[PDB]
Amino acid sequence: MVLSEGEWQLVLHVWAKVEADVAGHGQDILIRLFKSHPETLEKFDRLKHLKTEAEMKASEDLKKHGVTVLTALGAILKKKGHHEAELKPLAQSHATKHKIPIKYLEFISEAIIHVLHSRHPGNFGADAQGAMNKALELFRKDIAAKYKELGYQG
Numbered sequence: 829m830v831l832s833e834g835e836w837q838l839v840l841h842v843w844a845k846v847e848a849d850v851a852g853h854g855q856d857i858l859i860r861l862f863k864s865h866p867e868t869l870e871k872f873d874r875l876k877h878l879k880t881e882a883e884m885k886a887s888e889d890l891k892k893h894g895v896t897v898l899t900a901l902g903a904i905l906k907k908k909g910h911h912e913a914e915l916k917p918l919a920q921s922h923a924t925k926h927k928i929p930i931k932y933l934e935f936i937s938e939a940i941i942h943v944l945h946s947r948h949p950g951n952f953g954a955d956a957q958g959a960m961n962k963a964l965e966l967f968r969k970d971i972a973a974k975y976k977e978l979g980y981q982g
């Protein structure tokens with residue numbers, strides 16, 4: 829797939845709001861992912877022991893990681909589809925080191941869309957949500973094509 833430039837604008841216009849608080853959004857997103865789909869927390873060897881949302885909220889390691897995730901994703905969105913170099917090292921670690929199935933990337937995509945919708949209703953109407961979803965689907969499709977070259981297609 830290919831997004832039009834107006835779709836990328838909608839995506840980078842909300843993203844600019846997210847970047848006002850990268851650590852807070854990181855936290856929200858990862859917590860929404862873990863509560864919705866608890867099985868995903870098992871993949872994290874540092875975080876696994878967390879039992880409640882109160883524990884998640886107070887974890888400095890969860891917050892540090894959320895910043896790591898959003899910073900990497902942001903650098904990929906800002907590429908506007910020309911992200912092949914940024915996707916290589918990411919596809920290699922998630923496919924052969926962490927072992928993250930495509931299904932899980934769909935779950936965090938859902939958590940990103942949930943949080944933006946709650947925090948940014950004015951900049952995340954139906955068109956901008958459709959453009960964010962298209963941008964994350966492009967991301968998943970290109971990662972999945974890389975997982976298969978790497979021998980994982982998980």
Ligand code: HEM
Pocket residue numbers: 868869871872873874896897900901917918921922926928932933936
């Ligand atoms: C929007 C998609 C995602 C982005 C952009 C992302 C990004 C990253 C980055 C930049 C790192 C550190 C460098 C590396 O290991 O490659 C990382 C590590 C990791 N990622 Fe992801 N990730 C995403 C989705 C996921 C999901 C959905 C899971 C599990 C459900 C997962 C589990 C992990 C684990 C287990 C590590 C290692 C954490 C640690 O022990 O420090 N990732 N991720």
